[PDB]
């Protein structure tokens, strides 16, 4: 019944883009694929580095859809392989919106974070 000291995190970006034009939402969302990567590497990973046992994440991937809705729901997911279990899902989510302390202007409202697998080693 071995015990797990790290957990695996899926960090997600969730953006709604205007599509008054009624184009493919894969193509509308693709517009800010590069933005999302640059945001992942320059802000999101850095501010979660503190919590990882070992540096290590998957390449951020967009979720394919099949629609042309007036508002496009765009979602990217990346996986961070090992984060100390000591840091709960809530504290990791907070780390996304707040850095400097007592802060009131939240950042990255578009970003969220789950535990993808409770049972990882470091």
Residue numbers in the entry: 1 to 122
Can you list sentences taken from the study reporting this PDB entry?
The Dothideomycete Leptosphaeria maculans, causal agent of oilseed rape stem canker or blackleg disease, is one of the fungal pathogens in which suppression of ETI by the presence of an AVR gene has been demonstrated. Surprisingly, despite low sequence similarity, AvrLm5-9 and AvrLm3 are structural analogues of AvrLm4-7, sharing an anti-parallel β-sheet covered by α-helices. Structure-informed sequence database searches identified a larger number of putative structural analogues among L. maculans effector candidates, including the AVR effector AvrLmS-Lep2, all produced during the early stages of oilseed rape infection, as well as among effector candidates from other phytopathogenic fungi. These structural analogues are named LARS (for Leptosphaeria AviRulence and Suppressing) effectors.
The structure of AvrLm5-9 was solved using iodine single wavelength anomalous diffusion (SAD) signal from a derivative crystal and then refined at 2.14 Å resolution using native data. The structure of AvrLm5-9 consists of a central β-sheet made of three anti-parallel β-strands. The connection between the β1 and β2 strands is a curved α-helix and the connection between the β3 and β4 strands contains a shorter helix surrounded by two irregular peptide loops. The two last polymorphic residues were mapped onto the AvrLm5-9 3D structure. The mutation leading to virulence towards Rlm9 is situated in the middle of the long helix, and the mutation having no effect on the interaction with Rlm9 and Rlm5 is in a loop connecting β1 and β2. Neither mutation is expected to perturb the 3D structure.
